[PDB]
Symmetry: C9
Subunit: 30 residues, 9 copies
């Protein structure tokens, strides 16, 4: 369903945010 | 559907936030 | 529809947050 | 409609958060 | 309506968060 | 109603987050 | 109700996040 | 119910975020 | 159900964010 798909896309967005935080961590580390 | 589309736009907003975090990481790195 | 429009406005809010993060990145860079 | 209005108020809250982030950026910049 | 009111209270919470960010900005500025 | 009450509790949680941010601001200021 | 309970658990999670922020504030201070 | 369970899992995710913040606090403290 | 599954995926996303914060903590100290 399309609503379920929208929720799954939101989840993917949150995972992208997590990756961004990991990049910040690498930036702090050096 | 329009509600599903709204959820998909929210997901895109989250992806933009992720990109902002990546830019912050680059800003720390230099 | 008005509920869908509300979701779309939320998405726009998230994009504004992303722009704020990009400004923070620029602030760190200089 | 009142639920739609609630969503629109949430969006306005997100925009205020974005402005807060922009103020942080200005604080970093000088 | 009570659900709408709940959403409006959430919006107010987000505005309080925005104010907290503005206070952080002032703290960075001096 | 109980769903409305749940939303109101979420709003209170957001207000607590705002207070946390205010404490961070005070920590930066001194 | 169980949906209401789910929302209340989310609220508790937000309060835990708030406490984490307060701990960060103490760490800065 | 499965929707309720999804909300409860989201709550657990937020608690994990809180633990991450506590780890950041420890990182600042040392 | 698929909506419930979507919520569960959101929860997993939040857990990934938590791990990112832990990585930031390690980066700080």
């Amino acid at each position: 369903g399309e609503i379920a798909q929208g929720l799954k896309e939101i989840a993917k967005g949150l995972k992208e945010i997590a990756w961004g935080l990991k990049e910040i961590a690498q930036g702090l580390k050096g």
